[PDB]
Design a protein around this motif. Structure first.
Motif, PDB file in Angstrom:
ATOM      1  N   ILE A   9       0.864  -1.212   0.000  1.00 21.90           N
ATOM      2  CA  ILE A   9       0.000   0.000   0.000  1.00 21.90           C
ATOM      3  C   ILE A   9       0.885   1.241   0.000  1.00 21.90           C
ATOM      4  CG2 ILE A   9      -1.886   1.226   1.058  1.00 21.90           C
ATOM      5  CD1 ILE A   9      -3.090  -1.288   1.926  1.00 21.90           C
ATOM      6  N   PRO A  10       0.750   2.113  -1.026  1.00 21.89           N
ATOM      7  CA  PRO A  10       1.540   3.337  -1.089  1.00 21.89           C
ATOM      8  C   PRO A  10       1.441   4.178   0.184  1.00 21.89           C
ATOM      9  CG  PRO A  10       0.541   2.953  -3.208  1.00 21.89           C
ATOM     10  CD  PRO A  10      -0.031   1.909  -2.259  1.00 21.89           C
ATOM     11  N   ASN A  11       2.583   4.690   0.634  1.00 25.96           N
ATOM     12  CA  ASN A  11       2.684   5.574   1.824  1.00 25.96           C
ATOM     13  C   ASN A  11       1.645   6.704   1.733  1.00 25.96           C
ATOM     14  OD1 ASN A  11       4.008   6.603   4.224  1.00 25.96           O
ATOM     15  ND2 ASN A  11       4.743   8.237   2.869  1.00 25.96           N
ATOM     16  N   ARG A  12       1.573   7.372   0.575  1.00 25.58           N
ATOM     17  CA  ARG A  12       0.678   8.544   0.358  1.00 25.58           C
ATOM     18  C   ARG A  12      -0.779   8.134   0.564  1.00 25.58           C
ATOM     19  NH1 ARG A  12       2.593  12.815  -2.554  1.00 25.58           N
ATOM     20  NH2 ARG A  12       0.599  13.712  -1.875  1.00 25.58           N
ATOM     21  N   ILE A  13      -1.149   6.905   0.196  1.00 18.87           N
ATOM     22  CA  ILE A  13      -2.536   6.372   0.351  1.00 18.87           C
ATOM     23  C   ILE A  13      -2.788   6.051   1.839  1.00 18.87           C
ATOM     24  CG2 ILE A  13      -3.957   4.334  -0.205  1.00 18.87           C
ATOM     25  CD1 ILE A  13      -4.157   6.342  -2.428  1.00 18.87           C
ATOM     26  N   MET A  14      -1.777   5.553   2.568  1.00 22.96           N
ATOM     27  CA  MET A  14      -1.921   5.298   4.029  1.00 22.96           C
ATOM     28  C   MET A  14      -2.051   6.636   4.773  1.00 22.96           C
ATOM     29  SD  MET A  14       0.448   1.867   4.707  1.00 22.96           S
ATOM     30  CE  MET A  14       2.040   2.492   4.167  1.00 22.96           C
ATOM     31  N   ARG A  15      -1.544   7.747   4.221  1.00 20.80           N
ATOM     32  CA  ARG A  15      -1.527   9.055   4.934  1.00 20.80           C
ATOM     33  C   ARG A  15      -2.650   9.989   4.476  1.00 20.80           C
ATOM     34  NH1 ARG A  15       3.381   9.617   7.945  1.00 20.80           N
ATOM     35  NH2 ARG A  15       4.787   7.897   7.432  1.00 20.80           N
ATOM     36  N   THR A  16      -3.244   9.790   3.297  1.00 19.74           N
ATOM     37  CA  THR A  16      -4.189  10.796   2.738  1.00 19.74           C
ATOM     38  C   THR A  16      -5.425  10.912   3.625  1.00 19.74           C
ATOM     39  OG1 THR A  16      -5.453  11.548   0.906  1.00 19.74           O
ATOM     40  CG2 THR A  16      -5.344   9.152   1.168  1.00 19.74           C
ATOM     41  N   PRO A  17      -5.957  12.135   3.869  1.00 24.22           N
ATOM     42  CA  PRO A  17      -7.255  12.306   4.532  1.00 24.22           C
ATOM     43  C   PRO A  17      -8.451  12.206   3.567  1.00 24.22           C
ATOM     44  CG  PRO A  17      -6.314  14.454   4.036  1.00 24.22           C
ATOM     45  CD  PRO A  17      -5.328  13.419   3.533  1.00 24.22           C
ATOM     46  N   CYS A  18      -8.201  11.978   2.283  1.00 31.61           N
ATOM     47  CA  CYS A  18      -9.242  11.894   1.225  1.00 31.61           C
ATOM     48  C   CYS A  18     -10.118  10.643   1.360  1.00 31.61           C
ATOM     49  CB  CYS A  18      -8.595  11.913  -0.153  1.00 31.61           C
ATOM     50  SG  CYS A  18      -7.947  13.554  -0.574  1.00 31.61           S
ATOM     51  N   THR A  19     -11.362  10.734   0.910  1.00 33.50           N
ATOM     52  CA  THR A  19     -12.259   9.580   0.666  1.00 33.50           C
ATOM     53  C   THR A  19     -11.853   8.863  -0.626  1.00 33.50           C
ATOM     54  OG1 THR A  19     -13.844  10.776  -0.636  1.00 33.50           O
ATOM     55  CG2 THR A  19     -14.175  10.807   1.783  1.00 33.50           C
ATOM     56  N   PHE A  60     -11.506   1.003   4.375  1.00 38.57           N
ATOM     57  CA  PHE A  60     -10.065   1.296   4.398  1.00 38.57           C
ATOM     58  C   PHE A  60      -9.845   2.786   4.712  1.00 38.57           C
ATOM     59  CE2 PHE A  60      -6.097   2.651   2.480  1.00 38.57           C
ATOM     60  CZ  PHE A  60      -5.214   1.792   3.093  1.00 38.57           C
ATOM     61  N   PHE A  61     -10.525   3.659   3.973  1.00 37.69           N
ATOM     62  CA  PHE A  61     -10.302   5.125   4.078  1.00 37.69           C
ATOM     63  C   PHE A  61     -10.931   5.682   5.366  1.00 37.69           C
ATOM     64  CE2 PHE A  61      -9.123   4.707  -0.419  1.00 37.69           C
ATOM     65  CZ  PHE A  61      -7.866   5.263  -0.283  1.00 37.69           C
ATOM     66  N   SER A  62     -11.812   4.928   6.034  1.00 38.84           N
ATOM     67  CA  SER A  62     -12.341   5.248   7.398  1.00 38.84           C
ATOM     68  C   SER A  62     -11.249   5.141   8.476  1.00 38.84           C
ATOM     69  CB  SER A  62     -13.536   4.396   7.762  1.00 38.84           C
ATOM     70  OG  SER A  62     -13.137   3.122   8.267  1.00 38.84           O
ATOM     71  N   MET A  63     -10.166   4.400   8.252  1.00 35.48           N
ATOM     72  CA  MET A  63      -9.139   4.166   9.300  1.00 35.48           C
ATOM     73  C   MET A  63      -8.114   5.295   9.268  1.00 35.48           C
ATOM     74  SD  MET A  63      -8.487   0.066   9.437  1.00 35.48           S
ATOM     75  CE  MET A  63      -8.003  -0.120   7.710  1.00 35.48           C
ATOM     76  N   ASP A  64      -7.369   5.468  10.364  1.00 31.72           N
ATOM     77  CA  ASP A  64      -6.191   6.364  10.453  1.00 31.72           C
ATOM     78  C   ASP A  64      -4.973   5.608   9.940  1.00 31.72           C
ATOM     79  OD1 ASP A  64      -7.643   8.526  11.458  1.00 31.72           O
ATOM     80  OD2 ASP A  64      -7.205   8.017  13.581  1.00 31.72           O
ATOM     81  N   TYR A  65      -3.800   6.239   9.993  1.00 30.88           N
ATOM     82  CA  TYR A  65      -2.529   5.662   9.507  1.00 30.88           C
ATOM     83  C   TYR A  65      -2.308   4.294  10.171  1.00 30.88           C
ATOM     84  CZ  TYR A  65       2.274   4.889   8.202  1.00 30.88           C
ATOM     85  OH  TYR A  65       3.428   4.350   7.726  1.00 30.88           O
ATOM     86  N   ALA A  66      -2.519   4.163  11.496  1.00 26.84           N
ATOM     87  CA  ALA A  66      -2.264   2.911  12.257  1.00 26.84           C
ATOM     88  C   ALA A  66      -3.016   1.721  11.630  1.00 26.84           C
ATOM     89  CB  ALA A  66      -2.674   3.095  13.710  1.00 26.84           C
ATOM     90  N   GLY A  67      -4.335   1.862  11.479  1.00 26.01           N
ATOM     91  CA  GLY A  67      -5.250   0.875  10.880  1.00 26.01           C
ATOM     92  C   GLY A  67      -4.848   0.522   9.448  1.00 26.01           C
ATOM     93  N   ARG A  68      -4.601   1.528   8.616  1.00 25.82           N
ATOM     94  CA  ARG A  68      -4.211   1.340   7.205  1.00 25.82           C
ATOM     95  C   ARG A  68      -2.884   0.593   7.159  1.00 25.82           C
ATOM     96  NH1 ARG A  68      -5.790   7.165   4.353  1.00 25.82           N
ATOM     97  NH2 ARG A  68      -7.789   7.424   5.455  1.00 25.82           N
ATOM     98  N   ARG A  69      -1.942   0.962   8.028  1.00 23.32           N
ATOM     99  CA  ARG A  69      -0.598   0.335   8.093  1.00 23.32           C
ATOM    100  C   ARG A  69      -0.724  -1.126   8.554  1.00 23.32           C
ATOM    101  NH1 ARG A  69       5.283   0.066   6.915  1.00 23.32           N
ATOM    102  NH2 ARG A  69       6.308   0.245   8.968  1.00 23.32           N
TER     103      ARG A  69
END
Ligand SMILES: [Br-]
Ligand SMILES: [Br-]
Ligand SMILES: [Br-]
Ligand SMILES: [Br-]
Ligand SMILES: [Br-]
Ligand SMILES: [Br-]
Length: 123
Positions: A9-19, A60-69
């Motif tokens: 999973i791209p770093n930028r996608i784990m960090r983005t606040p976008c839907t 996926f996009f509902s989670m913060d960095y921790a969850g996505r990571r």
């Protein structure tokens, strides 16, 4: 075997606040080939698979960095972690496939409307 900052999973996608819909609208403008490739795949899927992919990407996009990571880590250590991949391996290809597309979309996705569900309709 183990996740890097950008795989799977791209770093930028784990960090983005976008839907999802912000990223998809950005892709339609700045990565149109990727958008149209994704929507061609999506439109060949049965309705229950289409809905399952929308539900899972919204999760996926509902989670913060921790969850996505943690999800990235879990899918890196086990290629079969994600049940949706039994039906449609590329269900998230527009979001997760590579860091070049990730940089271009996350650079501009914030300017689009968070809830524009028309990005899921094509032809
Ligand atoms: Br990479
Ligand atoms: Br879900
Ligand atoms: Br989280
Ligand atoms: Br998870
Ligand atoms: Br596939
Ligand atoms: Br992917």
């Amino acid at each position: 075997a183990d996740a890097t900052d950008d795989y799977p999973i791209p770093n930028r996608i784990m960090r983005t606040p976008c839907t999802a819909e912000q990223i998809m609208a950005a892709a339609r403008d700045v990565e149109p080939v990727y958008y149209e490739r994704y929507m061609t795949d999506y439109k060949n899927k049965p309705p229950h698979v289409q809905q399952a992919a929308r539900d899972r990407i919204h999760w996926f996009f509902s989670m913060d960095y921790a969850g996505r990571r943690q999800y990235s880590e879990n899918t890196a250590t086990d290629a079969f972690f994600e049940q949706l991949a039994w039906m449609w391996p590329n269900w998230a290809k527009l979001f997760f496939n590579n860091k070049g597309v990730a940089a271009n979309t996350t650079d501009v996705c914030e300017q689009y409307p968070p809830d524009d569900m028309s990005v899921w309709n094509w032809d």
